C-alpha cells in the first residue's frame, strides 16, 4: 500500500563489527512486524556525485522496504537527524 | 538645546525607528515609522529609515547640527541605510556606537591576583 525507498548513507569511518550492529538496528526498525522487502544489497568503495558535510567515504546498504503498517520508515528519518550516524537518507513514497 | 543633535537610530526587521534628539533627553522632532504608514513590511527596509528620518531631519528647525552621534543597535536588513540617511539628510555621520543588546554575561569580582 504505502511503499518507501530509504537510501541512507553511513559514516565514512565505522568498524565492520559496529557496522553489523548498526545495520542490525536499521533492519530491525525496517523488518519490524513483517519485513515484506524485495532484495538486500551492500555497496562498498564508491564516489558520490554530490558532496554533503565534506566527508571522505561512506558505506552503503540501500534496500527496498515495502510496508502496510507504516512503521518501517518511522524511526529511520529521526535516526538521520538526532544522532550522528546517518548523513544523507531518502523519503520516496512512490510504489 | 540648539547647535547639537544626539540622535539614536534603531535597526530592526519590523518598524525601524530613526529619530534625531538633542544633547539632553528631549525629542525635538517626531517623524519615523509611526508617522509613516506602511503595513507592507517596508517600514524597516533601506528606503524606510531614509524616508522616515527624511522629514525628521528636515522639519527640525532647532537642532540639525553637523554632528549626529548615530547609535545604531540591533540586527536589521538595512542597518547601513540609517547611517547614510543622516548623511543625505543635510548634516553628516561620524560618531557611531556599534553595541547591540547582546550581553556576554562577563563580569569580574575581587582583583589583587593573577
Amino acid at each position: 500500500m504505502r511503499t518507501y525507498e530509504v537510501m541512507y548513507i553511513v559514516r565514512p569511518n565505522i568498524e565492520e563489527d559496529a557496522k553489523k550492529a548498526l545495520v542490525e538496528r536499521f533492519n530491525g526498525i525496517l523488518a519490524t512486524e513483517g519485513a515484506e522487502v524485495l532484495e538486500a544489497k551492500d555497496w562498498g568503495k564508491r564516489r558520490l556525485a554530490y558532496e554533503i558535510n565534506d566527508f571522505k567515504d561512506g558505506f552503503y546498504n540501500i534496500v527496498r522496504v515495502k510496508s502496510d503498517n507504516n512503521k518501517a520508515t518511522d524511526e529511520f528519518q529521526r535516526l538521520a537527524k538526532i544522532s550522528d550516524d546517518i548523513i544523507r537518507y531518502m523519503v520516496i513514497r512512490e510504489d | 538645546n540648539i547647535e547639537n543633535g544626539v540622535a539614536h537610530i534603531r535597526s530592526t526587521f519590523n518598524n525601524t525607528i530613526v529619530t534625531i534628539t538633542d544633547e539632553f533627553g528631549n525629542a525635538l522632532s517626531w517623524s519615523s515609522a509611526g508617522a509613516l504608514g506602511f503595513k507592507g513590511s517596508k517600514k524597516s527596509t533601506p528606503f524606510a529609515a531614509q524616508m522616515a528620518s527624511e522629514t525628521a531631519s528636515k522639519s527640525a528647525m532647532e537642532h540639525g547640527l553637523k554632528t549626529v552621534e548615530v547609535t545604531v543597535k540591533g540586527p536589521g536588513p538595512g542597518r547601513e541605510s540609517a547611517i547614510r540617511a543622516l548623511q543625505s539628510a543635510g548634516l553628516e555621520v561620524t560618531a557611531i556606537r556599534d553595541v547591540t543588546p547582546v550581553p556576554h554575561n562577563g563580569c569580574r569580582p575581587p582583583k589583587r591576583r593573577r
Binding site: 537510501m7 554530490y50 554533503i52 544523507r88 537518507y89 531518502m90 523519503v91 | -
Partner: protein, 56 residues
C-alpha cells in the same frame, strides 16, 4: 536552530523549477535528500498569492 530558509527569500522559490513552474524532478538537484522537502515548501507557499505562474 538549523540552517532554514525564511519567508522573506523571494529568489529562493524558483531555483530548480521548470519554465511553467510545475513539480520539479528528483534527478535535477545535487545536494542532500532533506533539501527536497524545502524545495516543495517553496512551491506550495508561493502558490497562494500567485507569485509563481501555475502554467507559463
Amino acid at each position: 536552530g538549523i540552517t532554514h530558509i525564511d519567508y522573506k527569500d523571494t529568489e529562493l522559490l524558483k531555483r530548480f523549477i521548470s519554465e511553467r513552474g510545475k513539480i520539479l524532478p528528483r534527478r535535477v538537484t545535487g545536494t542532500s535528500a532533506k533539501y527536497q522537502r524545502m524545495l516543495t515548501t517553496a512551491i506550495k507557499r508561493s502558490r497562494h498569492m500567485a507569485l509563481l505562474p501555475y502554467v507559463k
